[PDB]
């Protein structure tokens, strides 16, 4: 499958890879953030491991692992990645053309 268990301590939520726009680490929380189509879900993980799950998952920034399949467009000058649900994240200079 392309099911991913988002571990949330006592409980987990299982989602499909392509439910995920991108994963985010935050300074506001000890957990990672899965950005789904219509909501965010926090969970325990690390971005390195998540990027290694599949070739669609790409570490473009210290804070973000993007799902390539859900990227709508990329602004290489501003280094903004746009997703199919209208969310965005950022990319480093080194990675923006590697997405």
UniProtKB/Swiss-Prot annotation:
Its main location: cytoplasm. The keyword DNA-binding applies. The keyword Phosphoprotein applies. The chain holds residues 140 to 238 of 238 of the full protein. Residues 4-99 form the HTH LytTR-type domain. Required for high-level post-exponential phase expression of a series of secreted proteins. Transmembrane segments: none annotated. It is found in: Cytoplasm. One of its GO terms (cellular component) is cytoplasm. Keywords: Activator, Cytoplasm, DNA-binding, Phosphoprotein, Transcription, Transcription regulation, Two-component regulatory system. GO terms for molecular function: DNA binding; phosphorelay response regulator activity. This is Accessory gene regulator A.
């Amino acid at each position: 499958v392309e099911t991913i268990e988002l571990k949330r301590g006592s409980n987990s939520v299982y989602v499909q890879y392509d439910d995920i726009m991108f994963f985010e680490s935050s300074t506001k929380s000890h957990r990672l953030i899965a950005h789904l189509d219509n909501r965010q879900i926090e969970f325990y993980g690390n971005l390195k491991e998540l990027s290694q799950l599949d070739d669609r998952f790409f570490r473009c920034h210290n804070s973000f692992v993007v799902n390539r399949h859900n990227i709508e467009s990329i602004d290489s000058k501003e280094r903004i990645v746009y997703f199919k649900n209208k969310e965005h994240c950022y990319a480093s200079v080194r990675n923006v053309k590697k997405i």
